[PDB]
Amino acid sequence: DDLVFAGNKALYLVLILSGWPTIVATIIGLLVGLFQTVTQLQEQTLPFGIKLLGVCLCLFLLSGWYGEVLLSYGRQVIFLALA
């Protein structure tokens, strides 16, 4: 029915939109961790400084697409509610 279908898509959209920013954030984390074990240095600001750029950057490039996804889903659900 039109409820379970609409409910599924809500969880599906979360995984899609947040996927790339969380993925890129994950990879960048491991790289700094590997580079640290290569040497005797120990620093905790280093991983944050590297990840900050990557997280903001990917959202910035993607911002144009997010509006396409949301503006179509909003119209879709409104029609089911009132059709």
Region of 69 (left: φ > 0; alpha: ψ -120 to 50; beta: rest) is alpha
Tell me, residue by residue from 18 to 47, as one string, x for binding to another protein by CB under 8 A and - for no binding: xx-xx--xx--xx--xx-xx----x-xx-x
Residue 30: CB minimum distance to another protein, A: 7
Q: Can you say whether the dihedral through the CA atoms of 29, 34, 37, 42 is positive or negative?
A: negative
Residue keyed to tokens 């491991």: 30
Give CA separation, 51 vs 32, 36, 77, in Å. 9, 15, 36
Residue 7: CB minimum distance to another protein, A: 6
Interface with another protein by CB under 8 A: which residues?
Answer: 1, 3-4, 6-8, 10-15, 17-19, 21-22, 25-26, 29-30, 33-34, 36-37, 42, 44-45, 47-48, 51-52, 55, 59, 67, 70-71, 73-75, 77-78, 80-82
